[PDB]
Design a protein around this ligand. Sequence first.
Ligand SMILES: CCn1c(-c2cccnc2[C@H](C)OC)c2c3cc(ccc31)-c1cc(O)cc(c1)C[C@H](NC(=O)[C@H](C1CCCC1)N(C)C(C)=O)C(=O)N1CCC[C@H](N1)C(=O)OCC(C)(C)C2
Ligand SMILES: Nc1nc2c(ncn2[C@@H]2O[C@H](COP(=O)(O)OP(=O)(O)NP(=O)(O)O)[C@@H](O)[C@H]2O)c(=O)[nH]1
Ligand SMILES: [Cl-]
Ligand SMILES: [Mg+2]
Lengths: 166, 170
Amino acid sequence: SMVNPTVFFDIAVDGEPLGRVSFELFADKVPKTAENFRALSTGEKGFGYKGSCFHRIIPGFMCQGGDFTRHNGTGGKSIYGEKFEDENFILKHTGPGILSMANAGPNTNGSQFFICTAKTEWLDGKHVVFGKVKEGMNIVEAMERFGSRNGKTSKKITIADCGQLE
Amino acid sequence: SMTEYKLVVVGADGVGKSALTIQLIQNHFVDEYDPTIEDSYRKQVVIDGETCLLDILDTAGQEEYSAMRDQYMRTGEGFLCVFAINNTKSFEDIHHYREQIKRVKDSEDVPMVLVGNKCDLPSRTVDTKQAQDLARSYGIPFIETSAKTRQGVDDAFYTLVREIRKHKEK
Ligand SMILES: CCn1c(-c2cccnc2[C@H](C)OC)c2c3cc(ccc31)-c1cc(O)cc(c1)C[C@H](NC(=O)[C@H](C1CCCC1)N(C)C(C)=O)C(=O)N1CCC[C@H](N1)C(=O)OCC(C)(C)C2
Ligand SMILES: Nc1nc2c(ncn2[C@@H]2O[C@H](COP(=O)(O)OP(=O)(O)NP(=O)(O)O)[C@@H](O)[C@H]2O)c(=O)[nH]1
Ligand SMILES: [Cl-]
Ligand SMILES: [Mg+2]
């Protein structure tokens, strides 16, 4: 916080403002993965999260988003190329608010990520944890209510704006 | 009257489990990839003159969550084991499904159909003979399908129902 950057998402539900979620990104322990998420949040590389959708929300588990390339849950890309390796597994999925990379197996990090709404310890050692919700966990809980058992959302949940808080 | 069958569609990610199911249910080909968590469908059909209700459980290709996957197999009466003809790994994955089904259901004879999907594509890596030989070694049917053209779709599901019925006769 003296060290770790803070980024925000302004969340929309069918275009309407829901609220702001901010995240502490653990650059102190997961610098490459934190830096990817930071840069995708500011859009400074010319692409990123702004406008993208939380496509998969399963109550009791997580809110997953970040596919800004295919817009269908299969895509995304990093600031380093299409994919980048698992940086470390120092941090674990210890409870609600944990911010962690989605993947399709080893070393397939791109831009998709998930926000835990519960402890998901079975993902430890397979998904790189790199941040946590700072403010706006109530907004994440509001988002979670739009999900369903199969991940489909009852309204479209988007990142209407995003950026870095100094 | 009628009967009801619990069919479970299994196979590796992206082989076409959902596309096959959606062709059976909705008679259209989903061109896009929408990765499944879990979906269920019902359809009333007549197979060999006998009306039945098909309960189709469309599973995700993922193989974690063994407790959930074991339950899918306990409840399922017959299994469509799908690979893609242009994905050798998905074909190599087939025996893991058969072994897990036999284990969960405590039986060496479980109704199953081996499905080689995406037969419309020019990128084949798994020979028909290779899949026929595997199916013969299991004593189960093998059906080549294309969810895109609809070739073999009804045949795959109806054959699975026939396999369940044959099993119930024992
Ligand atoms: C058996 C049913 N079942 C369950 C499950 C378990 C126990 C109890 N009840 C359930 C559900 C509620 O019973 C309906 C889960 C589950 C997950 C999948 C399928 C069925 C699942 C699943 C399906 C996928 O297609 C992909 C994944 C899981 C992993 C996912 N990767 C992707 O999305 C990637 C993209 C990201 C990189 C680019 C590609 N991709 C599409 C593929 C093909 O790899 C991922 O990284 N995460 C984050 C961490 C979270 C993960 N998703 C998840 O959704 O977990 C759900 C829960 C926790 C409930 C686990
Ligand atoms: N050409 C062709 N494409 C197919 C065929 N069946 C499926 N596809 C395509 O392959 C992709 C994956 O299909 P899908 O049915 O979602 O696969 P799945 O086995 O259900 N994947 P999952 O395990 O993630 O749920 C989609 O782009 C779909 O259009 C087929 O017979 N031919
Ligand atoms: Cl998972
Ligand atoms: Mg599917």
